[PDB]
Amino acid sequence: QANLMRLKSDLFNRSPMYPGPTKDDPLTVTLGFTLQDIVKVDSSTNEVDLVYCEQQRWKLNSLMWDPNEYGNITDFRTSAADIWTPDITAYSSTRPVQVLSPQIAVVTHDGSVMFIPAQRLSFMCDPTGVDSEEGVTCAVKFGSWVYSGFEIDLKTDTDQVDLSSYYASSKYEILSATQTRQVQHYSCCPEPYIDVNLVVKFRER
Amino acid sequence: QANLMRLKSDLFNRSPMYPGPTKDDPLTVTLGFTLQDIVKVDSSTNEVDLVYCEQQRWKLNSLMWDPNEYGNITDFRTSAADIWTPDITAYSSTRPVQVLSPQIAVVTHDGSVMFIPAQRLSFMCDPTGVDSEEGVTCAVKFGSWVYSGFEIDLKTDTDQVDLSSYYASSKYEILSATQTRQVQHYSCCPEPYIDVNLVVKFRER
Amino acid sequence: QANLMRLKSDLFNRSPMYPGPTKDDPLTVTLGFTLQDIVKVDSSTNEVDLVYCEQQRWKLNSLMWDPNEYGNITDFRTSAADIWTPDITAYSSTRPVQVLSPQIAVVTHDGSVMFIPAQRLSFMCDPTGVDSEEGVTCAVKFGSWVYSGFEIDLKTDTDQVDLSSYYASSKYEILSATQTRQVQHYSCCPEPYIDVNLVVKFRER
Amino acid sequence: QANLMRLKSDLFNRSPMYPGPTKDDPLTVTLGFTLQDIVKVDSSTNEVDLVYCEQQRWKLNSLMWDPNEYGNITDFRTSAADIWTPDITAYSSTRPVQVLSPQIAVVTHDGSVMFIPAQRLSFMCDPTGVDSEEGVTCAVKFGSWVYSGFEIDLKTDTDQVDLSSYYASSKYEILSATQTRQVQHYSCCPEPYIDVNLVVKFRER
Amino acid sequence: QANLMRLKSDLFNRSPMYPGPTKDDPLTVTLGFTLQDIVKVDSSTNEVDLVYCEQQRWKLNSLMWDPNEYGNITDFRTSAADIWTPDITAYSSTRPVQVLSPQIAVVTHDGSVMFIPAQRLSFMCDPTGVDSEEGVTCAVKFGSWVYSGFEIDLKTDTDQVDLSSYYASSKYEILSATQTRQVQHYSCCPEPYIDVNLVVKFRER
C-alpha cells in the first residue's frame, strides 16, 4: 500500500491534469466491443437495446513510471475520475446510455490505460424482419464527440465483435457482429473524422 | 500538453469567471439544429420526442489568446463546465431534456466557442393527421430563459434544419424542417425577446 | 463585465450567505402561476400532470446596491445556487417535480429577485368527469415547507392564472384557473400558515 | 440575519460534525407517519405505492445554545445536509424512495431537531382482496439500517397514523393505520434491534 | 462523541486514503446474499428483478485501533464514502442497479468492515417454465470488475442464500438459492479470477 500510495500521489497530485490530445500531440484510442445481450426491440419506435462491455485503450506519456522507483509495481487500479478519458460516444443513441459497471480503470507502468465500462444503449434500428430467418441488420457508429482524427485516432484490434459471453438464452440470436474503423470527411471541415461502425445482424429464436 | 496546460491555466485560473452578458456588453449566440430522429409520437398526450444535435456558438473576448505565446495552439477542447454557456432552452418542453452527448466544447483562439450537445426532447405537438399524406406540422421555440435581446442576441446561419444525418429508417419521414429567428415585443417592457422557431412537418412512412 | 464581476463579488464573496427569514426579519414572497399544458390524466391513480412556469419574487436588503458605484448596472442574471431561494413546495405532489428550465434568477439593484422555474408536476386530482361538458375541477396548494407566516408571507399579484401561453392544442381545455392566498391556523401554535391554492377546472376537447 | 448568521456559524463551523450516536452516547429518534395517499396498487408484482410525510425528531447536545447570547433566537431552519440525520429506512422497499419535499430541518435551542421529508415509497404488499369490503392489510417496517438499539432508540408519540390530511378522493380508502414500536432481541447478539411497524388496512371505493 | 470524533479524525484525516489492494498486499472480501423478493419477471426480454441485501466484509490494517486509546470504543458507523469499498459487481445486469438502503458501513477495531447495501437488480434470466411445478432456474455471477484473484479474493461464509426474510407473499416461491465461489482462468492473462455464482430456482405460486 505505502508504495502504491506514493506512486498514485506522484502521478496525480504532481502536475495539472492531462489537458487532452491536440493536433500536435495526438493520441490513439483502441475500441473493442463485447456484445452480451440484445435485450429489447421496440418495433413501434425503432429503438433497440444492447448490453455490451466497451473496451477502451490509450497510452499517456504523463502516466509512465519506473517500477524500481515504486516497489516493483507494474500496475494499479484507480477511478476513471482520477484520469483523463476519451469522449467515445454513440451517434444514433436515443436515450442516455446507462452505465452497468464501476468507473474504474487500470493504469500500467508503460503509461497504458485500460477501461472497460459495461453499458445499456438504446439506438436507432428498424427491426422489421427480425422475426424471419435471414433476420435483420442494424448499426450504430461510435467515435469521439469533439475530437477529430487530428487529435484522436481510433483503431480496432479486430473486425470481430467478441461474442464469447453473449447471453446463451437471449430472445435474439446473433448472426454476425462487426467492428470496423471508418474515416469520413465533411465538406465544411478539412479534417478527418474517425468512427468505429458496430454492425450486428440478428433474429428471433 | 505542457503548452495547452499553461494556456488552459492562464485562461481559467486567472480572473473570476465571465459573469455573463449584460445590456452594456451584449453577446450573440448562433443556433443551428440538426434533426436526427423523430422517435416517438404520443397521440394521447400530444407529446412528441425529437433527437437532435443543437449547435451553439458565441464569442468571448475573455477567451482570446495569441497562438505564438502558447506554442502555435489554435484551439483546444474543454468541459462545458470550465466555461460560461448560454441558457438556451425549449419553451414547450414537457419533460426534462435528456443529454445524449458529452458536455465538451471547443474554444478557438479568436475567442469563439463551439458547443454541440445532442439531446432527446419531449415537446407539445398534436400529431393528429401524422398518418395522412399531407402529414402534420408541429413546432417548438428555443431561446434564452433569463436574458432578453438586450443581453443575448440569437442568430441562425440558415433557415434550413440540417437533415443530412436524419435516421434513414425512422418511423416518421421529414417533409420540411425550419429554424427561424423571431423577435417578440411587448408594450409592458421596452426590451426585445428573441427565439428560434423549430418547425418540422412530418408523416408516417 | 469587469464591473458586473466586481458587483457579483462584493455581493456574494463578502459576508456569509443570507440565513433565511426569521420571525424578527420576515420576508414576503410573491407567487404567480402560468399554466402551459395539462399533459396527462391518469384515471386509475388520480394523478394529473401540469406543466407550468412558477413565478417567485422576494426582496433582500442584503442584495441592494448603488448602480453609480458599479458602472450604472441595474440588474444581473445569476445562478439560483448563488443565492437564497424560498422553499415553495406543492403539498399534494405524488412524484418528485421535474424541472424544465434553467436555475437562473434576476437580481435587481433594489434588492428584488425574480426567479421563474418551469416545472412538470404530478398531483392528486380525481379526473372523473373530465370527459363531460361541465368538466372536472382539481386543486393543489403551494406554500413553504418549513416556514410559517411569521417568517415567510405569501402574496399574489392576482387571482387569475396566466393562461396566455397555454398550449393551443392540448388534449385538455381550461375552463378556469385560479391562484388564491389562503391562511390556515393550527389548533396548537398561534402562527398563521400561508398557501396559495391553485385551482383549475378543465375538460377534454 | 446578522445574529442567526453568527449562531449558525458557531454551531457548524466550530467543531467537527457530530459523528453519530454510539453505545456510550445513545440517541433517541421519534417517528410519526402521516399518510397522504395510496397512489397505485400493482397486483402483478405485489408492489404498493404510498405517499406520506415521515416526521423525525432527535436531540443533540452539540446543537444547544442560549438565545440570550444570540439575539433572542429560539430556532432556525437549515439544510438537512448541514447536520447529522438518522438513517431511518424502509425494509420492504422495492424501489428507491422518491423525495417529495425540501431537505430542510428545524433546529431549536434546546438542541432538538425536527425534520419532515415527504416521500413516495414502493413496498411489498399483496393487494389481493383490496376490491372486497373487509379490504386488505399490508405492512412495512421502518428502522435504522446500521445502528442497533444500543445506539439509536426508536419511539412513537402514538399508535395512530395521522390520517388528517389523507387525500379525500384517493382510489383507496383507509380502514386503519398503525405505527408500532417493536423490539427484536436475538440471543446471538445481545443488542436490541428496533423498528416501527407501519400497518395500513385499506380497500377500493 | 468527543472520543469517536477524535478516532474518526485520526483514521481518516491522517494519511492518504487506502489505494486498494495490490498483488503484493491482497485483500479478502466475503460475500453473502439475502434474497428478499423476486419482484418482476419479464418473459419478453428475459429480464428478471431481484431485491436482495448484499453483505460485504473485508479487513484493512489501516483501519485498526486500540479501544483503550479512544475511550473503550469498539466500533463506529460511517459513510461508505469515507472509506474504500470493493467494486463487487453483477455480470449479467441489464439495468443500472438501484440502491435501496443507506451507504453506511460499520468499522470495527480489529480493522474489519461490514457493509450491507440493499439493491434491486435486473439480470438476464429466461423465466420460461416459471409457471410449472418444477419451476425455472436462473443465475447471475458477482465479482470484482477490475481486480483479479491476485488482488481481491472472494469467499463465502456459506452455500445457502439467506432466505429467512424472503417476502412471504411474493408472486414467486423460492425452491432453492445458492451462493458459490468459482475460480475462472482466461486465455489472455496468467492470473486467476473469482466470482460468486447466485443461483435461484423458483416458480409461481
GROMACS .gro file of N, CA and C in nm, chain B residues 95-147:
model
  159
  300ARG      N    1  -4.099   1.743  -2.058
  300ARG     CA    2  -4.016   1.660  -1.973
  300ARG      C    3  -3.873   1.712  -1.978
  301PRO      N    4  -3.801   1.699  -1.867
  301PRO     CA    5  -3.663   1.744  -1.864
  301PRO      C    6  -3.585   1.680  -1.978
  302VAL      N    7  -3.525   1.765  -2.058
  302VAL     CA    8  -3.444   1.720  -2.170
  302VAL      C    9  -3.334   1.622  -2.126
  303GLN      N   10  -3.322   1.509  -2.197
  303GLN     CA   11  -3.212   1.413  -2.175
  303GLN      C   12  -3.090   1.441  -2.264
  304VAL      N   13  -2.971   1.445  -2.203
  304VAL     CA   14  -2.850   1.477  -2.277
  304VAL      C   15  -2.786   1.350  -2.331
  305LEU      N   16  -2.752   1.351  -2.460
  305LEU     CA   17  -2.708   1.230  -2.530
  305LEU      C   18  -2.559   1.226  -2.561
  306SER      N   19  -2.494   1.341  -2.555
  306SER     CA   20  -2.352   1.352  -2.585
  306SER      C   21  -2.274   1.409  -2.465
  307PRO      N   22  -2.141   1.406  -2.473
  307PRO     CA   23  -2.055   1.471  -2.373
  307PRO      C   24  -2.072   1.623  -2.366
  308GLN      N   25  -2.048   1.677  -2.246
  308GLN     CA   26  -2.054   1.820  -2.222
  308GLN      C   27  -1.917   1.883  -2.246
  309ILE      N   28  -1.872   1.878  -2.371
  309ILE     CA   29  -1.741   1.930  -2.406
  309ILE      C   30  -1.752   2.030  -2.519
  310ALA      N   31  -1.679   2.141  -2.507
  310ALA     CA   32  -1.685   2.244  -2.609
  310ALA      C   33  -1.549   2.266  -2.670
  311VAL      N   34  -1.544   2.349  -2.774
  311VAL     CA   35  -1.420   2.378  -2.844
  311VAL      C   36  -1.394   2.528  -2.847
  312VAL      N   37  -1.296   2.570  -2.769
  312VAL     CA   38  -1.257   2.710  -2.764
  312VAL      C   39  -1.146   2.734  -2.867
  313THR      N   40  -1.160   2.841  -2.945
  313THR     CA   41  -1.066   2.875  -3.051
  313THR      C   42  -1.001   3.010  -3.021
  314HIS      N   43  -0.883   3.034  -3.077
  314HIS     CA   44  -0.801   3.146  -3.031
  314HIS      C   45  -0.863   3.284  -3.049
  315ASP      N   46  -0.955   3.295  -3.145
  315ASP     CA   47  -1.026   3.422  -3.165
  315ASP      C   48  -1.128   3.447  -3.056
  316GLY      N   49  -1.143   3.350  -2.967
  316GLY     CA   50  -1.234   3.362  -2.855
  316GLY      C   51  -1.370   3.303  -2.884
  317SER      N   52  -1.382   3.234  -2.996
  317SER     CA   53  -1.509   3.172  -3.031
  317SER      C   54  -1.524   3.035  -2.965
  318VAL      N   55  -1.646   3.002  -2.925
  318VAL     CA   56  -1.673   2.874  -2.864
  318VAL      C   57  -1.777   2.799  -2.944
  319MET      N   58  -1.749   2.672  -2.975
  319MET     CA   59  -1.848   2.585  -3.037
  319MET      C   60  -1.883   2.472  -2.942
  320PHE      N   61  -2.013   2.453  -2.921
  320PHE     CA   62  -2.063   2.353  -2.829
  320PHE      C   63  -2.187   2.284  -2.887
  321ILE      N   64  -2.181   2.152  -2.901
  321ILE     CA   65  -2.286   2.082  -2.974
  321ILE      C   66  -2.340   1.963  -2.897
  322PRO      N   67  -2.428   1.988  -2.802
  322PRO     CA   68  -2.488   1.881  -2.723
  322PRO      C   69  -2.597   1.809  -2.800
  323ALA      N   70  -2.599   1.676  -2.795
  323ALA     CA   71  -2.710   1.602  -2.855
  323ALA      C   72  -2.815   1.577  -2.748
  324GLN      N   73  -2.942   1.592  -2.786
  324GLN     CA   74  -3.049   1.592  -2.687
  324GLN      C   75  -3.168   1.509  -2.732
  325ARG      N   76  -3.239   1.448  -2.637
  325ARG     CA   77  -3.374   1.396  -2.665
  325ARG      C   78  -3.478   1.482  -2.593
  326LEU      N   79  -3.566   1.543  -2.671
  326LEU     CA   80  -3.658   1.644  -2.619
  326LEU      C   81  -3.800   1.595  -2.633
  327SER      N   82  -3.883   1.623  -2.533
  327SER     CA   83  -4.026   1.598  -2.548
  327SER      C   84  -4.102   1.729  -2.543
  328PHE      N   85  -4.171   1.761  -2.651
  328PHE     CA   86  -4.239   1.889  -2.658
  328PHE      C   87  -4.386   1.871  -2.696
  329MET      N   88  -4.463   1.978  -2.678
  329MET     CA   89  -4.604   1.976  -2.713
  329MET      C   90  -4.630   1.986  -2.865
  330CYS      N   91  -4.699   1.884  -2.917
  330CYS     CA   92  -4.723   1.864  -3.060
  330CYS      C   93  -4.846   1.775  -3.071
  331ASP      N   94  -4.953   1.825  -3.132
  331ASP     CA   95  -5.069   1.743  -3.164
  331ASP      C   96  -5.045   1.673  -3.298
  332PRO      N   97  -5.019   1.542  -3.294
  332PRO     CA   98  -4.976   1.467  -3.411
  332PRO      C   99  -5.094   1.419  -3.492
  333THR      N  100  -5.213   1.473  -3.464
  333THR     CA  101  -5.332   1.436  -3.539
  333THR      C  102  -5.309   1.457  -3.687
  334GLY      N  103  -5.319   1.350  -3.765
  334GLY     CA  104  -5.300   1.359  -3.909
  334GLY      C  105  -5.163   1.315  -3.955
  335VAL      N  106  -5.080   1.274  -3.861
  335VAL     CA  107  -4.947   1.224  -3.895
  335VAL      C  108  -4.959   1.100  -3.984
  336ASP      N  109  -5.075   1.036  -3.984
  336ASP     CA  110  -5.096   0.914  -4.060
  336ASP      C  111  -5.155   0.941  -4.199
  337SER      N  112  -5.161   1.068  -4.237
  337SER     CA  113  -5.212   1.107  -4.368
  337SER      C  114  -5.097   1.131  -4.465
  338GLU      N  115  -5.127   1.186  -4.582
  338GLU     CA  116  -5.024   1.210  -4.681
  338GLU      C  117  -4.965   1.350  -4.667
  339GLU      N  118  -5.050   1.448  -4.642
  339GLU     CA  119  -5.005   1.586  -4.626
  339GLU      C  120  -4.940   1.605  -4.490
  340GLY      N  121  -4.951   1.502  -4.405
  340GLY     CA  122  -4.883   1.498  -4.276
  340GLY      C  123  -4.932   1.595  -4.170
  341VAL      N  124  -4.850   1.617  -4.068
  341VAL     CA  125  -4.883   1.712  -3.962
  341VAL      C  126  -4.766   1.805  -3.933
  342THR      N  127  -4.796   1.929  -3.894
  342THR     CA  128  -4.691   2.025  -3.864
  342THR      C  129  -4.689   2.060  -3.717
  343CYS      N  130  -4.570   2.058  -3.657
  343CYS     CA  131  -4.557   2.092  -3.517
  343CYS      C  132  -4.439   2.185  -3.495
  344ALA      N  133  -4.437   2.255  -3.382
  344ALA     CA  134  -4.329   2.350  -3.356
  344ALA      C  135  -4.295   2.373  -3.210
  345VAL      N  136  -4.171   2.417  -3.190
  345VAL     CA  137  -4.117   2.445  -3.057
  345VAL      C  138  -4.016   2.559  -3.063
  346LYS      N  139  -4.029   2.656  -2.973
  346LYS     CA  140  -3.939   2.771  -2.970
  346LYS      C  141  -3.820   2.747  -2.877
  347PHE      N  142  -3.701   2.787  -2.921
  347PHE     CA  143  -3.581   2.783  -2.838
  347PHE      C  144  -3.529   2.925  -2.818
  348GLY      N  145  -3.482   2.955  -2.698
  348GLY     CA  146  -3.432   3.088  -2.666
  348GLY      C  147  -3.369   3.092  -2.530
  349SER      N  148  -3.323   3.208  -2.487
  349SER     CA  149  -3.271   3.222  -2.351
  349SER      C  150  -3.383   3.226  -2.248
  350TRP      N  151  -3.358   3.176  -2.128
  350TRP     CA  152  -3.462   3.172  -2.026
  350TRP      C  153  -3.467   3.300  -1.943
  351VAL      N  154  -3.352   3.363  -1.922
  351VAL     CA  155  -3.346   3.479  -1.833
  351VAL      C  156  -3.292   3.604  -1.899
  352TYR      N  157  -3.231   3.588  -2.016
  352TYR     CA  158  -3.171   3.701  -2.087
  352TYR      C  159  -3.260   3.751  -2.202
   0.00000   0.00000   0.00000
